[PDB]
Symmetry: C6
Subunit: 257 residues, 6 copies
């Protein structure tokens, strides 16, 4: 089998494309910009400054998973069992995971919170090896009979850049990063799930990790803080989709409008 070696026919590609599902962000304009919601079989980067709502979209996504109405798919190309009792893995790199906030967004979504918490796996990663190693251990979690359908890496680069300071080591960091990006892409594809990552920015404008990361994300956003609680999502890279801006808000309800 060629599929076995990591190769895919032009046709395999066309086939695997049918079984993409999309997860709603609780946001009309944001959903619209993505063409329905966040895709399975892709890595999606949300980049921006502390407070731009990256961690928030992450937590919203874990609640939204526990609501089958928020998962859009072709009923013909994807079985209901594919998306059955779906679960999420949340790799927490800086301690951003808020159980309460899960509860809160759930309550407002009418989803049971207790239920979300029970279907969300949380891996507290204190350094890049742990981070990488956790992403790998997702195969084992699936193979434990856990239908992992959502993967969150929050954040993607925090550890790497706390570890590699001083340009005398970039090339290892860039190489680990590429490994990690590879794994992330691996499990989006071969377990048909959505893979979301949060990232930071810098000057004179870019998301951390240079091209290694950019080339390896399918969909890339910037998140800017608009007035008060409104936010803007700038989609600037997409496999086919056009480049657009979604405004939305983060309130006590969670993500809205």
């Amino acid at each position: 089998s060629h599929m076995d070696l990591g190769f895919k026919s032009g046709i395999d590609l066309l086939k695997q494309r049918s079984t993409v599902w999309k997860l709603s962000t609780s946001s009309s304009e944001l959903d619209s910009v993505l063409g329905g919601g966040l895709e399975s079989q892709s890595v999606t980067e949300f980049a921006g400054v502390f407070g731009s709502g990256k961690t928030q979209i992450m937590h919203q996504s874990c609640v939204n998973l526990q609501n089958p109405e928020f998962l859009f798919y072709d009923e013909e190309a994807v079985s209901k069992g594919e998306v059955a009792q779906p679960k999420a893995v949340y790799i927490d790199t800086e301690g951003t995971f808020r159980p309460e906030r899960i509860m809160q967004m759930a309550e407002h979504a009418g989803i049971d919170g207790q239920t979300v918490l029970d279907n969300t796996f949380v891996a507290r990663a204190y350094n890049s090896d742990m981070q990488m190693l956790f992403a790998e251990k997702i195969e084992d979690l699936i193979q434990e009979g856990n239908n992992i359908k959502l993967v969150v890496i929050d954040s993607l680069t925090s550890t790497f850049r706390n570890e590699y300071t001083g340009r005398g080591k970039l090339a290892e960091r860039q190489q680990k990063l590429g490994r990690h990006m590879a794994t992330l892409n691996k499990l989006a594809d071969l377990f048909n799930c959505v893979v979301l990552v949060t990232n930071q920015v810098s000057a004179a404008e870019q998301a951390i990790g240079g091209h290694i990361v950019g080339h390896a994300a399918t969909f890339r956003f910037f998140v800017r803080k608009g007035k008060g609680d409104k936010r803007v999502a700038k989609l600037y890279d997409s496999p086919h989709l056009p480049d657009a801006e979604a405004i939305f808000r983060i309130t006590e309800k969670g993500i809205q409008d």
Copy 2:
């Protein structure tokens, strides 16, 4: 299963959160700021200059453990047994451990100094390898069946900053540190003990080990010197507790007020 892999569910996170218990520091103001006292299942950092009292708080924590009335827990949540015959580990990195100082504190506190001394295991560490390894051997100490309910690391970073001078190997250092922070956090959580780390500062305001240490510690204090024997501990990082200041004294009685 998933536990074996390092993953916890949201619901396990709340289930954890009921069995947390608390150790008094013998200062009312410091216990107050702490929300009752030093918490288990968290790493607690005391940063500040030589002579600011960090070693004193580590010692007092060893004395206070051997006093059932100094551990605050939920009777309906934490078995009377899980917290009985409590032992501390004191990984001593610059030779700060004074048994004479233990005596003094226990006497004054009305505790048997002898008892204290007998349930405080001291591990003298001359370098980061020894320091890091002793911490992992805590797992082994509890396998033998010792109720380790307190882990001291005094100090957290002295070895690392003596082993790494000049930007040469700085990336290894930063990861070695992250690896050490994981073990510390791992053993606070898994064994429901309190973990205290002392650290130094540098300018114009920070604790050594950068953010790699920072994100890894759940409570963080800077300890300042007041006049004479008074000191001020400044909680500036905690999950759900307000940034407050706590004044106290260091006397022949140990930590008081």
Copy 3:
């Protein structure tokens, strides 16, 4: 035998030369320039800026493979058996493989888009380990009875230059490149097939990879953006051919003129 180590005798080189075939690029001039077209047992490089058509030629190439009329060979020395069910492999470095563009190219040239997508393997590589390893796996695709006659490496250098930003680790880069470059040649030469690499450029005039690449590339082009949709391809290094330019276009038909 000496038919096992890596030494091809002089005579073996001549007997080697007998079995070379050619694949039309769909331009008259470009073909002309090439001694007839893209040689098997050789590596061919298209270097130039983004949008210069490098990728297009790769695609055009995959399409053209499934059309025995576009494959010129020795009737008497290349047994017509050996060129049948010809499959292509396309190692894709930054997500350039457009399956639809394969449809397009196919139609406007009267080929089964379906046959082409069916006989094109696509290895998505997120880093240079994956890229090199995909390349080594072509031995194994063949071992499972796939008549791989076309290899595409698009890009040749995008992963390397992303991993070795910061020229402390340049030597391992260069060596890694070299090692890959061997593979590419070995498998052109031992499995009688054509290997195409695309490359990017720099300044004041050179193709990325320097000389390690240059010395291992047998045919070498610069691709310049002429007016609007026309393009020129400058052949600068070849075994025995004249140095010359070639114009053609890129349209919805594909590579033309």
Copy 4:
């Protein structure tokens, strides 16, 4: 036990403390600054310039170990067999060991010069590996039936400053030092004996090795040259001893007054 894991109870520490013995230096003023003599279970450092006595003290000690009256201890806590047939190890790093000088010192202290040579082991180390490896090999030397009670390391740092010259690989050095200081300490403790190290000085007024060494040396002197054959030794680190200066002389007899 915990005892074998590297952990000592606070009671074990008190226990251990009863079995520390002392070793006279042959100078009254020096002994008194040491509060008896060179202590077992501790590392002692003499640091000063070439010619300031350091090596003389090592020699003098090798002699004095074979005068059983020069050993001070608690006959209640240390048995006569623990200090019986006492052998010294002399790790010679630059060629400082003078058998002649050993004879000489002994003839004058009424010790049999021959007995001394016969029970002083000498390891000639040309480099840091050899030096460290010999220190570790003291285990096997004892595990062979040799009551090693005195270990000389003269010099402590000469090999390292000759191997790592000007910053760059400073870290491997600083950790190799740490590993060595670990070993020296361990065998002082586990085999209840005296470890003495010689060291040089630098710019100001500090001993080579920085803090890795300082934090790991229990007692630390600077030895200055007074006039002619007189010297002064400055105690400036000790757990419970007053910092103080001892004057003494070096003569045909060895250390004296």
Copy 5:
């Protein structure tokens, strides 16, 4: 034996001295300078800019090898059946090996070129590793029964200098070169054959590789361009012979005068 260890007696040296044969370069003047021709059991180096004829000499030697007359030995030291059916190995570093030139040179030699191509193994190398390995694998070519009497390395340092650039891993390069030079000398010696190497020149008048290469090559020339097709060869380093210049030409014959 001691031969097995790589040790030779002074008498073994003289005995080897006997079995040395020499290969003509078709240059009278070159030949004479060499004291007869290229020596076996030595490494001969041709250093010069591109176009100076190193490759010409290399090729010519491959042909002259195939010419019974052209190999001068001693019949009272060496048997006709050790110089019989000789073969050459030719390591190609930049793809300089032109089998057509082989043919041409050979036709003009009154020797069949086809024969030469059959008695000439060519290893195409794209980097240091492959380069080194092929030269190792020559041992094995003598094992399958091949009478390898001529080893060509063209170029000696092109790969290395394409890999190691700057001051980064210059030491890693110099040691690699050394290992390489060991191998070449070893097989020159132990399989009594002639080893030739080509090299580039740099800035201020030296062959690339420095002393590592120079100390390790018995015979060294600086080949310069004279007027037109005339070339001059400066022997500057040799065992016993004086430093001399020899003029010659490169033509349709190959090397002449």
Copy 6:
């Protein structure tokens, strides 16, 4: 026992000192300055510029080993067995070994030149790996039952300083040197033989290798040119001898006066 681990008692050192024998240099002044001749059990270094006579002494030494008038020892301490059919090893670093010069020196001293070549083993080293391996391998030659009594390293540092050129990879050079100096010191001591090394100099006035070498060689000479053929060795380091200058000549006879 302790000789196994590398420990020598003080009395074993005294014993050692008795089996010490000495080899004449053929120079009166030189011999006188050495207190009789080059010593077994010691490493003697000759350092100086090219042409200073280093190699010449090496060669003289290989000759004088074959003339038993030229070996001085205690017949009571050293049985005539130990020094019978002695042999010598010459590790040759830059092709300095001259059988013809061995012959010549030997004729003039009335020794059979053939005899000297037959008991002189010659290792040609092209890099420090070989250099070091060679030296280690002398054990094996002794095991095969060759009475190795003379080890020459001509030269000590040529490889190392050729291989290293870049201040960060200097620390391995130094440790590698130290490792080898250890080997040389080992084998002088273990096999009661003389070990000679030649070294080049730098400026302002030092021999290459620094103190890593200086501390590991017992006897040390700076050899300078006089007028014409006269030469002057300056002994500047020796355990028990005064610094002194010895003048001699180098001629077709060899070393003389």
